């Protein structure tokens, strides 16, 4: 007779279970969001890395020329000077070959 | 009603298992990322590290090419000077008190290479000097090409000569080797 009792209690439980499944699935939709955020901002960290990878490269490659070029300026001159001294003779040899 | 009390605790106890299912299924998502990001950024550190050393190799390889040129640049400034002095030396010979002596040296030397021989050539810079073996031998001194001596033989034939500057381009080009060692020994 009371029917409603067994047919109403049968609803509250069903709609609390409903309510459970969703609030459950949100915690996954919550972590799914964090799953993006943690990737997006990992894309960022690496982007910031590139900077240093191109920048430190800049500063050192810019320095590498300084050190190499000022050794080019130094070593080229020091080979002139090596010749300068012995130079009279070079002609002395070349002149002798053609002469006879 | 104790009967439905048990239906409550049971259904409610099912709720407690759904939420826990979610939590672990979330924690694995959270941890899926933690690794996912770690595994890419490691991979993008790698690629950049090569984008560094291999870049620096081509920079270091550049500097050596600038030093190598630099040096070769310097040796040319020198080697050309030695060239000028040999030329200057050959060009200051005429006004030196030793030039007429050399004259018939190359005049005779060529005269041997042409056994037949009709006549010979030379400038007033030189030709006048040719009186020594102008009296002797053929006696033909007529022509003008001012550093060197030529000859014409077999009546006409192939008229073979001997330019003083043609001796340089040969002899310089040959022992340019003994000279470079002598310089940078």
């Amino acid at each position: 007779g009371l029917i409603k009792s067994l047919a109403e209690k049968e609803k509250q439980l069903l709609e609390r279970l409903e309510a459970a499944k969703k609030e459950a699935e949100e915690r996954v939709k919550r972590a799914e969001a964090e799953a993006k955020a943690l990737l997006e901002e990992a894309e960022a960290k690496a982007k910031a890395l590139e900077a240093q990878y191109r920048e430190r490269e800049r500063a050192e490659t810019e320095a590498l020329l300084a050190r190499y070029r000022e050794r080019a300026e130094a070593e080229a001159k020091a080979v002139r000077e090596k010749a300068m001294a012995r130079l009279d003779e070079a002609v002395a040899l070349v002149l002798k070959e053609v002469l006879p | 009603s104790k009967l439905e009390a048990i239906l409550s605790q049971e259904v409610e106890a099912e709720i407690q298992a759904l939420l826990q299912e979610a939590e672990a299924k979330a924690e694995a998502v959270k941890r899926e990322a933690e690794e996912k990001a770690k595994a890419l950024l490691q991979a993008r550190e790698r690629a950049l590290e090569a984008q560094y050393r291999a870049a620096l190799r081509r920079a270091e390889s550049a500097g050596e090419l600038l030093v190598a040129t630099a040096r070769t640049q310097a040796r040319g400034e020198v080697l050309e000077e030695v060239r000028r002095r040999v030329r200057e030396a050959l060009e200051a010979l005429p006004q030196k008190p030793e030039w007429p002596e050399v004259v018939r040296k190359l005049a005779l030397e060529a005269l041997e290479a042409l056994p037949g021989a009709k006549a010979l050539v030379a400038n007033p810079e030189d030709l006048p000097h040719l009186e020594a073996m102008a009296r002797e031998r053929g006696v033909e001194l007529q022509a003008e090409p001012r550093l060197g001596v030529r000859a014409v033989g077999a009546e006409g034939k192939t008229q073979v000569e001997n330019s003083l500057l043609a001796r340089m381009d040969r002899a310089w080009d040959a022992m340019s080797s003994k000279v470079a060692q002598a310089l940078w020994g």
Side-chain angles (χ1 to χ4, degrees), chain A residues 5 9-10 13-14 16-17 20 23-25 27-28 31-32 35 38-39 42-43 45-46 49-52 56-57 60-61 64-65 68-69 71-73 75-77 79-80 83-84 87-91 94-95 97-100, chain B residues 4 7-8 11-12 14-15 18-19 22-23 26 29 33-34 37 41 44-45 48 52 55-56 59 62-64 66-67 70-71 74-75 77-78 81-82 85-86 89 102 167-168 171-172 174-175 179 182-184:
Chain A
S5 174
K9 179 62 171 165
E10 214 94 328
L13 278 294
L14 254 165
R16 144 151 259 194
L17 279 177
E23 186 250 286
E25 95 178 54
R27 213 153 183 172
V28 177
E32 279 167 24
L38 187 52
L39 264 289
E43 219 296 286
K45 277 187 178 279
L49 214 301
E50 297 170 50
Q52 293 160 332
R56 165 160 271 207
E57 169 165 13
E60 295 206 54
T61 194
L64 263 307
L65 287 180
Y68 265 84
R69 202 170 299 182
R71 145 201 247 245
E73 293 181 63
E75 186 163 358
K77 174 172 157 288
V79 311
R80 294 168 185 150
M84 292 303 177
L87 194 153
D88 286 28
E89 286 101 343
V91 187
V94 171
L95 293 182
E97 199 145 55
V98 297
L99 91 80
Chain B
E4 75 184 79
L7 177 49
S8 289
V11 176
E12 190 67 23
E14 164 57 28
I15 283 179
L18 270 177
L19 300 182
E23 215 71 43
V29 168
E34 282 169 5
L41 169 147
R44 275 163 49 69
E45 181 195 73
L48 290 182
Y52 179 101
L56 270 257
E64 301 277 17
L66 173 144
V67 168
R71 286 167 56 91
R75 288 213 185 118
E77 294 176 354
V78 160
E81 173 54 28
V82 176
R85 287 206 183 175
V86 172
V102 174
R167 301 194 68 86
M168 186 174 180
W172 161 267
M175 270 191 162
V179 319
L183 286 149
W184 302 278

Side-chain angles (χ1 to χ4, degrees), chain B residues 64-72 74-89 91-95 97-100 102 104 107 110 113 115-117 119 121-122:
Chain B
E64 301 277 17
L65 179 271
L66 173 144
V67 168
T69 53
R71 286 167 56 91
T72 304
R75 288 213 185 118
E77 294 176 354
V78 160
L79 277 160
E80 191 176 347
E81 173 54 28
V82 176
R83 245 256 200 74
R84 186 184 68 76
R85 287 206 183 175
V86 172
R87 221 192 309 99
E88 181 194 341
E91 219 60 51
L93 220 73
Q95 70 170 27
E98 59 229 30
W99 168 246
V102 174
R104 351 86 138 198
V121 315

